[PDB]
């Protein structure tokens, strides 16, 4: 397999900012702080094969479906 990592994601970072925003906003420290205030008040890393002239990424998502205990 040609490359395990993929470092091509689009040059946009607004969406990654949104994601990290959500995750911190729900992080434990921030919920602690907000309740206290109310009382006081990176490649993708997927296999890449050369199919003739094209690079193509091979992946299976069965792990998230297994963890959520749902069929794939």
């Amino acid at each position: 397999e040609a490359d395990n990592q993929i470092m091509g994601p689009s040059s946009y970072a607004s969406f990654v900012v949104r994601g990290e925003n959500l995750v911190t906003a729900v992080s434990y420290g921030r919920v602690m702080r907000t309740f206290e205030h109310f009382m006081a008040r990176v490649p993708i890393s997927a296999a890449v094969i050369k199919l003739g002239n094209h690079a193509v990424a091979v992946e299976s998502l069965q792990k998230m479906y297994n963890d959520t205990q749902s069929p794939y």
Binding site: M64, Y65, D67, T68, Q69, S70
Partner: protein, 49 residues
Amino acid sequence: PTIAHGDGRRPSKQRTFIVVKNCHKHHISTEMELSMLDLEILHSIPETP
């Protein structure tokens, strides 16, 4: 964890399993015989070659 669905599917709440394991015990033994003649001379004090 779970997935969020668009169908009428009844969504599951937060779940959690609590599981217990227990020890299990084992015993082993073997026997040895020692002559009474053998034990005795250990406590005496030898006086000859």
